[PDB]
Every structure is written in structure tokens, then in C-alpha cells.
Amino acid sequence: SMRPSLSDYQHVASGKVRELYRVDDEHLLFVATDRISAFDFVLDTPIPDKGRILTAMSVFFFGLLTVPNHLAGPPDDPRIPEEVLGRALLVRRLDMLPVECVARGYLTGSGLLDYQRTGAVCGHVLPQGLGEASRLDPPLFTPATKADIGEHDMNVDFAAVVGLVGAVRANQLRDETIKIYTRAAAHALHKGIILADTKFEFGVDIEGNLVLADEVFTPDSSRYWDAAHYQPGVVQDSFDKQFVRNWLTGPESGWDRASDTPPPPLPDEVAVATRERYIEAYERISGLSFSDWIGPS
Numbered sequence: 001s002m003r004p005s006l007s008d009y010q011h012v013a014s015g016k017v018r019e020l021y022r023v024d025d026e027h028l029l030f031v032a033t034d035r036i037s038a039f040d041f042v043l044d045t046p047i048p049d050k051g052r053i054l055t056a057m058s059v060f061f062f063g064l065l066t067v068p069n070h071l072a073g074p075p076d077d078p079r080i081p082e083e084v085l086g087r088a089l090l091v092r093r094l095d096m097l098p099v100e101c102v103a104r105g106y107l108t109g110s111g112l113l114d115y116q117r118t119g120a121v122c123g124h125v126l127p128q129g130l131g132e133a134s135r136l137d138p139p140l141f142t143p144a145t146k147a148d149i150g151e152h153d154m155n156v157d158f159a160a161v162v163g164l165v166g167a168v169r170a171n172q173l174r175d176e177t178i179k180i181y182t183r184a185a186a187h188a189l190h191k192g193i194i195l196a197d198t199k200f201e202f203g204v205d206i207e208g209n210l211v212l213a214d215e216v217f218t219p220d221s222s223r224y225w226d227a228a229h230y231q232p233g234v235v236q237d238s239f240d241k242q243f244v245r246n247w248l249t250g251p252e253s254g255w256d257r258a259s260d261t262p263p264p265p266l267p268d269e270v271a272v273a274t275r276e277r278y279i280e281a282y283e284r285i286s287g288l289s290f291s292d293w294i295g296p297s
């Protein structure tokens, strides 16, 4: 249990709810936090154990899939500081590809909106008559690129991906994205949870291999829905975040989402209920017990 301090590692970067540290020239520490985002705001109130639960989830899916991934040691690797144990992974440093590899099995969000405006999504001209939460058969590769800080990603088509990473690599990204999405979506649905869409971040290792990195198939990287009352044609509830969304936009919060100003803190009971939803998604899909996952509660 002798472990380095987080302060022993250089802070490299990161986004809203995760952190990245340099361990050495070829390894990083990939840290999930308990912070949660809703309506594109990072909320004041952390969700207890969220970082650990989502790390456990990513680790499960990395083990399920047979494709190369960025894991470089066990979840209890001694290079991991105690203060992030269970919510941090020792990973291989990759050259990240500048494209968001999104797979959509169902039509919602910007995919639906692009379809309603144009009849197409990311260069895919779709059948007429689709709508909110329609199943996409087959699932779509719907790549995007990151835009300015704070604003939504830009949907692009396959030709744009070719110009970003090369023709052969673009085809490789497309094929792998669809393959692993299809497998994971079937696995989750078998247990009563729909993986509506998901985003992969790929990088390339020293050998030129395509490597799956960042987070995979978590509620932060994906839209999860409860299959039990999946109803094409209406907006589906977020499996994990609906209690948060309902409280924020309900009569008790005092917050108007349309104001586009930072939301107030959550009730502790809502945070704990949300924690339980994350655990439920993890346990149902993985078939493992979160009580066995490492790290402090």
C-alpha cells in the first residue's frame, strides 16, 4: 500500500470531469472524478463513487472486447496514488487521433436534428419516416470533431475523417467503431439496457497500432436507456441522469434551464439515488459486484 502521491506526477491536461497525469515518457494516469455534467454544466454536487463506478465499467468493457486498448497495468497498480485508487488507470501514452468516433444505434440528439433538417446524418442518407428514438438499422458511424471550448462537437462525414487521419485509417476507424458498438449494444440490451449511442477516442501507439483509449461505454461516453419501456417516438429517459435532470428542471430547484446560467447544487438524496443508478447499470451489464471494486467508498 506504499503508493506515490498525485503531486509526484505532472498534470498533463484534461476536460470537464476527468484528469490526465504524466507517469513517465510512455505512461499516463487516467483519472475519473465524481463530478457530473448535466445540460452541459458541471454540477456543484459530486456523485459519490461515480469515478470509481465508471472506471470499473470501462475496465469491464476493455476486458470484454478483444481490440487493443490503452490499459498498461492492473487497477491496483502500485503507481496509482491512494487518493484516486479505483478511479484511475495506468495507461499507455498514445498519439490521439483528432476525431470523435461516434456510433449511433438510435436516432436522437444532433443525429435526429440533422436528419430532420436534411434527411441525412454525417453523410448517411436515411429512410424517410424516422423520428425520435428510432432504431437505426444498421447502426451508423457518425464522426464528429471537437469545436471551441464549451460548444458542441461538429458532425462530419467519412470524407472529412479521411482528410483528418488518412483513407486506410479512416476505414479502420469506421469498421472498428461499428464492430465494437454492435457487440457492446447487444450485450447491454440482453440485460435490459439500451446503448443508444457511444463515443470512442482512439490513439496510435509507437508501432502504428490503432488503440482504444479514454473511457469506453460509460454513461459519460454513451447514452444509456432502460429497455423495459423503450418507446420509439418519444424522448427516452436517461438511465443514470434522469433524477438529476428532473430535479433541476422541476419545481424545487428554482432554476430555469433556459436561462443558460449555472445550475444550483443537487439534493444529497438525488446524488445518492444517481449513485445507485450507476451501480445498477454497472452490475447489470458487467455481471460483477461493485462491492468487489477496489478503492475507498
Ligand SMILES: Nc1ncnc2c1ncn2[C@@H]1O[C@H](COP(=O)(O)OP(=O)(O)OP(=O)(O)O)[C@@H](O)[C@H]1O
Residues within 6 Å of the ligand: 013, 014, 015, 016, 017, 018, 019, 020, 028, 030, 070, 091, 092, 093, 094, 095, 096, 201, 203, 213, 214, 215
Ligand atoms: N491513452 C491516452 N493517451 C493519450 N491521451 C489520452 C489517452 N486517453 C485519453 N487521452 C486524452 O486525454 C485528454 C483528456 O481526457 P478527457 O477524457 O478529459 O477528455 P475529453 O473526453 O475531451 O473530456 P470531455 O469529454 O469532458 O470534454 C483527451 O484529449 C483524451 O483524448
Ligand SMILES: [Mg+2]
Residues within 6 Å of the ligand: 014, 015, 016, 017, 018, 019
Ligand atoms: Mg473530462
